[PDB]
């Protein structure tokens, strides 16, 4: 997998060497094709995972993501052509390159055989992200948000560093292939009960768990649209990908060491879903929607039943695409409105007829409408959770009712009701804004036709 | 300085560490340490400002008593073994003295009070020498005697330094002292692995030298001893803003940059030796060091602090360039990580 | 560590014994990296000194890309040796002190009985 | 090119990684042994030069 | 030692006088010249860990 990567690196030379006026089209047009080369990995006509080479591999779980990581770079670069079009021609070429490095790094992290290669690349992604959030962040508080995003991930990260070096000594190689075909069975000691927490905690932090998710609402609030898309679509899912490949070892402990997180997540799912119900900042509501719909995932990567896992793989890819779509349209309202407040800007369909159709489809993806991969995902996690304990439906049942309420409230108070009297007149929709959306949903429609590709390792 | 004097002094400041390293007769190692003490004091008071005399008089007393303690260890050994050099048989107290003494000259842990203060009153230039070409000498003496020193003490001085360095740095706003504090911290990691794998001490030093030498020549390019002063870097010289950003995050352990390797292999070696208690606590507060590094990042790069009108005047005039060493030592430092296996 | 080994060359860079090892291919990814590492140093310099970034010092750019690379071949040539000594040393010991590193028989899974924790 | 290439490539990747793993662990055992044993080329700490003694006729009987 | 510029250069400015059995002026052997010899020709080729 060096075509999904080397051609990517070369994007950096192109963003720099290219003309200031033509820099945007060379980069966006080329990474669209970079995504097309990424599609070749999907050709698995057999079960055997595709070990491209010693360090680089792609199995069913990584492949559905590498393609998404390559896909969003085009979109990210199309959603940030407006803001970042007021810059000095060298601030742009830095932002474009920053976005380019994220997927170079993220493509490799999702396509990495050695778990510590994951760690080095895993924690590197913070550098590009922190720059995108802090340097171009509009609000006074991004310095703070950046600190929260760096420390919560970093304090979790050093325990994983110690744990992975620890298993290398215990087993003798951090190669995901071998670690899988070798006998690593923890022994339920008090210490192992700590190892397990060391490995999972760093992944559980960037996958916002109810206890440590305050970093994500603060980060996406002041982050520029491209950073918020990356955090929701690819960055948070780095934590999920890690939990799937790391729990191959630590096989016995999670049977009983998971209860704490599972309950934290399911109760967390309800409270995070509910506070979405009365949050005035739209970007705030989407972020907590992201916490709740990701709290379902940590509760399926821990129950560990075949269906959970691919419920997880289905939902992660699906929610990634949906969340961005929501964060992308939130930005389009923010740029004309100039405020994140949900109460202002009422009635837009009256003035932006189509964006409202995109808003409606994004919300229906947000809630579980049935001919969507989003529902298949939740339906499956719901099933397994029920298997874990029939009572789980109650808590995963209060979340579904709340999820319907906030998803439609975003449509009802942003895209319906009487028009706002006279905010700065809202200029019509650009074709870029609409495509950036179409590019998010057309793939959501196509993937829903053949869900098999994003089903995970389990199935 | 009459250029002749400059030569004699500089030769001594350079013959000082070199005799230490080359000789085996400890005595000759002691006088190597003694010269370094004599040569550095003249340069320290070059401005001869009231702050400077204070600096040198502290540096000298701290250095002198430690030098006398190191000599006492050699004198005692001479009577416990006729040899003029530490051996397997050496009384444990004899070696511990040498650790404390040498940990004072290097300024590690509970003897970390002199360094921040002398780093504050000396010029940026002599600051570098006082931080990096004066640590080579004592460390050489320790690295030579590693097989014999105590694992317990070193670790305590190691951990303490890491903490003191980190905590001290958080509050400081003067750059010279932020660096002094960082050096205490890095010096700590170095002395942690000495008992186990000296060869890694020599890596955690070089990398510190290849990181600090560019960082200081950066601080002086604009001769800013204040963060507020380095924050207006964007107006005085915009290009160094990019690398100053990476070098400081490299000084802390963040993974893509070269700075991770020293911490990573030291942790790998300590876990190989089973100190998974000690290594863990060190790595954790090591994370405190990055917080103050990033706070500076914020002021200098990620956010643009307001500047005075006269800054436009300094822009007009051609900026005297930074030596080439900056580049070669900025890149070899910010990004060599892809080449770690051969470094270790 | 590896110092104190018999025959150690007290101050030499790479003892001739390292002749026996294969020479590093000049295009070894690493040496090529050092090259790029170098080009960047050059470009960076131009930038910090405020010169046209790429179109200036085309002589220097060469000195850099060619100094770093030169250094590489002769360094890697050594680091390669050091690692090679490590095996000579390591493998030898495994034998000279055989009992301590005994070959082990691993029972076919048929025989071994790892317990099965059910997920249910 | 086929199912054959990845299956055979993955087995080659596993053999390199399995052999690297066994050696890395044996290093740690050899390095534990030579440190304490001191019977191997690594961890051979120095003692003074024999070349500097003086077995020459001294000025007093009984050296 | 750390940098053996002495063995390399072949010079011996610091080794000739490190132990009591080294050449004493006018060949006046010191006390113990007998032992130290016996204790360093023993520990020669045997590293410290096994000179102890």
């Amino acid at each position: 997998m060096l075509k999904i990567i080397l051609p990517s690196l070369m994007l950096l030379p192109l963003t720099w060497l290219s003309s200031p006026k033509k820099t945007w089209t060379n980069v966006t047009s080329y990474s669209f094709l970079i995504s097309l080369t990424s599609l070749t990995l999907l050709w698995q006509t057999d079960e055997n995972y595709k070990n491209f080479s010693n360090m680089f591999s792609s199995d069913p779980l990584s492949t559905p993501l590498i393609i998404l990581t390559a896909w969003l770079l085009p979109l990210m670069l199309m959603a940030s052509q407006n803001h970042l079009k007021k810059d000095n021609n060298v601030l742009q070429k830095l932002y474009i390159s920053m976005l380019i490095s994220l997927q170079i790094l993220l493509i490799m992290t999702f396509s990495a055989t050695e778990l510590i290669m994951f760690y080095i690349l895993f924690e590197a992604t913070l550098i590009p992200t922190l720059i995108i959030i802090t340097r171009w962040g509009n609000q006074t508080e991004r310095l703070n948000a950046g600190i929260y995003f760096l420390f919560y991930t970093l304090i979790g990260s050093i325990p994983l560093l110690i744990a992975l070096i620890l298993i290398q000594n215990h087993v003798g190689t951090l190669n995901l292939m071998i670690l899988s075909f070798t006998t690593h069975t923890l022994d339920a000691s008090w210490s192992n009960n700590l190892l397990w927490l060391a490995c999972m905690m760093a992944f559980l932090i960037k996958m916002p768990l109810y206890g440590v998710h305050l970093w994500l609402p603060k980060a996406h609030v002041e982050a520029p649209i491209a950073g918020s898309m990356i955090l929701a679509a690819i960055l948070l899912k780095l934590g999920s990908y890690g939990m799937i490949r790391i729990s191959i070892i630590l096989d016995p402990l999670t049977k009983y060491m998971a209860y704490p997180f599972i309950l934290l997540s399911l109760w967390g799912m309800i409270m995070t879903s509910s506070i979405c119900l009365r949050q005035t900042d739209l970007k705030s509501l989407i972020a907590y929607s992201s916490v709740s719909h990701m709290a379902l995932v940590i509760a399926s990567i821990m129950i560990q039943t075949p269906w959970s896992f691919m419920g997880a793989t289905m939902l992660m890819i699906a929610h990634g695409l949906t969340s961005s779509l929501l964060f992308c349209l939130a930005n389009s309202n923010y740029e004309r409105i100039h405020s994140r407040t949900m109460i202002m800007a009422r009635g837009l369909q009256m003035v932006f007829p189509l964006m409202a159709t995109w808003w409606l489809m994004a919300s229906l993806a947000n809630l579980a409408l049935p001919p969507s991969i989003n529902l298949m995902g939740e339906l499956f996690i719901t099933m397994s959770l029920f298997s874990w304990s029939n009572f789980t439906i109650i808590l995963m049942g209060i979340n579904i009712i709340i999820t319907g309420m906030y998803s439609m409230y975003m449509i009802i108070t942003t895209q319906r009701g009487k028009l706002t009297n006279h905010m700065i007149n809202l200029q019509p929709s650009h074709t870029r804004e609409l495509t950036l959306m179409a590019l998010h949903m057309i793939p959501l429609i196509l993937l829903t036709t053949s869900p098999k590709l994003i089903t995970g390792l389990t199935m | 300085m009459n250029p002749i004097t400059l030569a004699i002094i500089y030769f001594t400041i350079f013959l000082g560490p070199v005799i230490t390293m080359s000789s085996t007769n400890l005595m000759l190692m002691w006088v190597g340490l003694e010269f370094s003490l004599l040569a550095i004091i003249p340069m320290l008071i070059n401005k001869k400002n009231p702050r400077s005399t204070e600096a040198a008089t502290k540096y000298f007393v701290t250095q002198a008593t430690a030098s006398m303690i190191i000599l006492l260890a050699i004198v005692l050994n001479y009577k416990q073994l006729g040899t003029w050099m530490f051996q397997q048989q050496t009384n444990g107290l004899i070696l511990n003295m040498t650790l404390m003494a040498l940990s004072m000259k290097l300024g590690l842990a509970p003897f970390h009070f002199w360094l921040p203060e002398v780093t504050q009153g000396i010029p940026l230039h002599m600051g570098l020498i006082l931080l990096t070409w004066q640590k080579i000498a004592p460390l050489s003496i320790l690295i030579q005697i590693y097989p014999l020193l105590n694992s317990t003490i070193i670790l305590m001085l190691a951990i303490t330094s890491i903490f003191m360095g980190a905590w001290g740095g958080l509050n400081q706003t003067q750059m010279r002292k932020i660096m002094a504090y960082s050096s205490i911290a890095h010096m700590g990691w170095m002395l942690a692995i000495l008992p186990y794998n000296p060869s890694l001490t020599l890596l955690n030093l070089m990398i510190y030298i290849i990181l600090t030498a560019p960082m200081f020549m950066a601080l002086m390019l604009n001769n800013s001893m204040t963060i507020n002063s380095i924050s207006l870097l964007w107006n005085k010289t915009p290009a160094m803003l990019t690398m100053i950003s990476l070098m400081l995050l490299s000084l802390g352990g963040l993974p893509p940059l070269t700075g991770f390797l020293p911490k990573w292999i030291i942790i790998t070696e300590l876990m190989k030796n089973n100190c998974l208690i000690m290594a863990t606590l060190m790595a954790m507060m090591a994370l405190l060091n990055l917080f103050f590094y990033t706070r500076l990042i914020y002021s200098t790069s990620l956010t643009m602090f307001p500047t005075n009108n006269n800054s436009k005047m300094m822009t007009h005039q051609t900026k005297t360039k930074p030596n080439l060493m900056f580049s070669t030592l900025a890149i070899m430092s910010t990004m060599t990580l892809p080449l770690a296996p051969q470094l270790i | 560590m590896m110092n104190g080994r018999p025959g150690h060359e007290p101050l030499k860079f790479l003892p001739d014994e390292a002749r026996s090892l294969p020479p590093p291919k000049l295009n070894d990814p690493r040496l090529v990296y050092m090259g790029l590492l170098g080009y960047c140093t050059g470009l960076m310099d131009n930038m910090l000194r405020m010169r046209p970034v790429m179109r200036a010092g085309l002589h220097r750019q060469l000195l850099f890309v060619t100094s770093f690379v030169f250094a590489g071949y002769f360094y890697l040539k050594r680091q390669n040796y050091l690692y090679a000594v490590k095996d000579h040393d390591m493998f030898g010991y495994i034998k000279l002190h055989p009992e301590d590193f005994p070959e082990k028989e691993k029972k076919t899974y048929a025989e071994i009985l790892e317990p099965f924790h059910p997920v249910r | 090119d086929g199912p054959e290439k990845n299956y055979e490539k993955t087995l080659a990747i596993l053999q390199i990684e399995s052999e690297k793993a066994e050696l890395r662990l044996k290093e740690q055992e050899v390095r534990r042994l030579m440190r304490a044993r001191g019977d191997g080329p690594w961890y051979q700490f120095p003692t003074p030069e024999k070349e500097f003694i003086d077995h020459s006729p001294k000025a007093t009987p009984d050296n | 030692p750390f940098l053996d510029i002495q063995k390399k250069l072949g010079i011996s400015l610091d080794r000739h006088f490190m132990f009591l059995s080294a050449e004493q002026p006018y060949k006046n052997a010191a006390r113990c010249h007998a032992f130290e010899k016996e204790w360093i020709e023993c520990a020669h080729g045997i590293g410290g860990t096994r000179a102890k």
């Binding site: 080479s53 010693n54 360090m55 990495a112 055989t113 050695e114 510590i116 290669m117 080095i120 951090l174 190669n175 | 770690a340 296996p341 051969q342 270790i344 | 018999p6 014994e17 390292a18 026996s20 090892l21 294969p22 690493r30 390669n80 040796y81 690692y83 090679a84 000594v85 490590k86 095996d87 000579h88 040393d89 493998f91 030898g92 010991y93 000279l96 | 390199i16 052999e19 690297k20 050696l23 890395r24 001191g38 019977d39 191997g40 080329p41 051979q44 | 020709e41 023993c42 080729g45 045997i46 590293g47 096994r50």
Partner: peptide, 27 residues
């Protein structure tokens, strides 16, 4: 009687086995 010298590992160098066995550096 004096103790024997540590034994001498013997042979000729051969390129290291599988290369630097560092972290995923296939070297």
């Amino acid at each position: 009687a004096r103790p024997e010298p540590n034994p001498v590992i013997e042979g000729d160098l051969k390129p290291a086995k599988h290369g630097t066995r560092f972290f995923f550096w296939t070297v």
